[PDB]
């Protein structure tokens, strides 16, 4: 009880310490948990032969960026 009240809640802590702890907590709780899906679109874009006949290569079929 008193051994738990003796340690200060973060309102007694200096603001810089609480800011650092909030930065870590924000990171793990929000930035790490943030999820966006891009893999299918990225692979589809990387597998496209980009205007290879349009630009004058005059050579063999050059491999795509994914290849």
């Amino acid at each position: 009880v008193v051994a738990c009240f003796r340690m200060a809640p973060l309102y007694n802590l200096p603001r810089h310490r609480a800011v650092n702890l909030f930065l870590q907590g924000y990171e793990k709780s929000w930035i790490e948990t943030e999820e966006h899906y891009f893999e299918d679109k990225l692979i589809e874009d990387l597998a496209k032969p980009g205007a290879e006949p349009p630009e004058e290569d005059e050579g063999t079929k050059r491999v795509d960026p994914l290849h």
């Binding site: 009240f5 870590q24 907590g25």
Partner: protein, 81 residues
């Protein structure tokens, strides 16, 4: 800076209201003050849980809105708009 300052002020207000409500019984007192007795890292970890609609954290809506707006602005700046 200002987010943590407002958070600390509101935690002081909540702690005062918790201290001034100890007449009926002390059974609810322990679960009320578990937040203030938790380690400082765990306090922020459980108090930043207002993402999604779980809303177990005691953070009030006006403070929640500030972080929710700043996070959207940060995602827009990062290009995940």
């Amino acid at each position: 800076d200002d987010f943590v300052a407002k958070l600390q002020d509101n935690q002081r207000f909540r702690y005062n209201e918790v201290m001034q409500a100890l007449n009926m019984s002390a059974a609810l007192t322990a679960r009320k003050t578990k937040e203030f007795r938790s380690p400082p890292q765990e306090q922020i970890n459980m108090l930043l849980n207002f993402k999604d609609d779980k809303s177990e954290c005691p953070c009030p809506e006006e403070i929640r809105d500030q972080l929710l707006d700043f996070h959207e602005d940060l995602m827009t700046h990062c290009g995940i708009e």
